[PDB]
């Protein structure tokens, strides 16, 4: 049930190739995938033990795979997967971050993409990802969290409302813009309901005000990747284009070793535009998405916290015992503490629902580690740990408590080689940790 506006448009953008896309378009079927984390301890091994060493790989990312994710079991609660549609995991890899950048994700609900960055930078250097709605900020803040992600500062704001903050800071700006989204037509029924005819119009504007601001907070040699999950000319080529006329920017080559569709000139009014990636339901795997990366060569202006004493002591005793050491700033807020990147500006003015690594809260006369913590765990031959069977796992997870002979008290509680929360053994009972808003 296409939009016949729609229809007459690709039509004449298409010519007899339109046939093939509307049949994609109606006939098809959505693609749906996921990647392991190679953030987490034994990452990969841990999907192929129970998951399973058969599944397909993803066309669009070296670690995606073509399948479903089971929500409710262990390797989706522990992080060790995250479900991405095959064709939105291109714009995490055309990215490609590199440990130790400053990397911002500026549209990234509900995490797809920050989670590919975050995989990339091996917990070096700093993630900034900004989600504009409070609600979906939170979904993204305990993604990022899920995932293990130990440098990353979650925000809360409108681009322009960073730019104050970041002017000229970053070595890389992801924009997965708000689009018409004729690229979502298949999986969801409402974006075709949504559509109208002036909406690629109303949306290239849109896009032109957030890289506006996007572009601001570029380093000198910066890279931008931009992004739409539309097939719209109006919010693709002629986006690069009006970058192009405007910007000191240069397109740039994105490496894949599978072969795509390409960015079409005539849709354009620059040079380059074939380096932009097209991915069509009708000639590619999955749903339909726009790429493009480019380097800028202009020059942007650049214009209590502390532990109690008993604080100081009550973490140092713990971080003792478990053996962790921290590597960023120790900060506390309402008696979280917080462990932030070195590379963190002052975040003073902004709206941040995720501060660095969340290592734990301070209570009566006492530490608590945090889930976070437990799910950033890398090195698990250097802490305490009590091995559980899935049935405990099952418990766990419901909020309950399992037996075990000892008293060692805060321990990681692991399941094969996949940490999956705190527990306490206090005489012979494991006492629970597993955050109440996660039980089932």
């Not at 130990?150 to 708000?178: C, M």
């Not at 074939?274 to 020059?299: M, N, S, Y």
């Not at 002052?346 to 006492?366: A, C, E, I, M, P």
Request: net charge neutral; proline share 6%.
């Amino acid at each position: 049930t296409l939009p016949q506006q729609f229809i007459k448009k690709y039509r004449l953008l298409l010519g007899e190739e339109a046939s093939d896309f509307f049949s994609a378009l109606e006939q098809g079927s959505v693609k749906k995938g996921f990647r392991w984390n190679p953030l987490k301890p034994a990452g990969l091994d841990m999907v192929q033990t129970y998951h399973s060493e058969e599944l397909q790989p993803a066309p669009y990312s070296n670690e995606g795979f073509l399948g479903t994710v089971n929500g409710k079991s262990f390797l989706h609660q522990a992080g060790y997967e995250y479900s991405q549609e095959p064709s939105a995991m291109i714009v995490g890899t055309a990215a490609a971050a590199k440990p130790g950048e400053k990397v911002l994700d500026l549209c990234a609900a509900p995490g797809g993409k920050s989670t590919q960055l975050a995989a990339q930078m091996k917990g070096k250097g700093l993630l900034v990802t900004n989600e504009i709605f409070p609600k979906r900020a939170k979904i993204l803040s305990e993604n990022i969290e899920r995932w293990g992600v130990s440098n990353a500062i979650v925000t809360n704001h409108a681009p322009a409302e960073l730019v104050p903050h970041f002017s000229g800071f970053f070595d890389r700006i992801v924009v997965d813009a708000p689009c018409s989204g004729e690229g979502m037509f298949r999986k969801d029924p409402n974006a075709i309901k949504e559509w109208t005819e002036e909406s690629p119009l109303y949306c290239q504007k849109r896009q032109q005000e957030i890289l506006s601001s996007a572009i601001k907070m570029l380093k000198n040699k910066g890279q931008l990747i931009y992004s739409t999950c539309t097939f719209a000319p109006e919010e693709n080529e002629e986006i690069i284009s009006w970058l192009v006329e405007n910007y000191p920017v240069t397109i740039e080559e994105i490496p894949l070793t599978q072969s795509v569709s390409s960015g079409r000139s005539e849709w354009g009014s620059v040079a380059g535009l074939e380096k932009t990636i097209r991915i069509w339901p009708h000639k590619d795997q999955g749903e339909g998405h726009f790429v493009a990366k480019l380097t800028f060569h202009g020059q942007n202006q650049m214009h209590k916290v502390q532990m109690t004493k008993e604080q100081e002591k009550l973490w140092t005793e713990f971080s003792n015992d478990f053996h962790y050491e921290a590597t960023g700033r120790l900060l506390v807020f309402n008696d979280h503490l917080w462990e932030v990147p070195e590379l963190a500006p002052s975040l003073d003015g902004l709206k941040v629902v995720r501060t660095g690594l969340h290592l734990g809260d301070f209570k009566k006369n006492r530490f608590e580690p945090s889930y976070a913590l437990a799910l950033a765990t890398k090195k698990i031959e250097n802490i305490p740990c009590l091995p559980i069977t899935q049935k405990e796992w099952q418990s766990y997870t419901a909020g309950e408590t399992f037996q075990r002979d000892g008293n060692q008290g805060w321990v990681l509680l692991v399941l094969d080689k996949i940490p999956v929360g705190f527990g306490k053994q206090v005489k012979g009972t494991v006492k629970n940790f597993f955050p109440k808003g996660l039980r089932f």
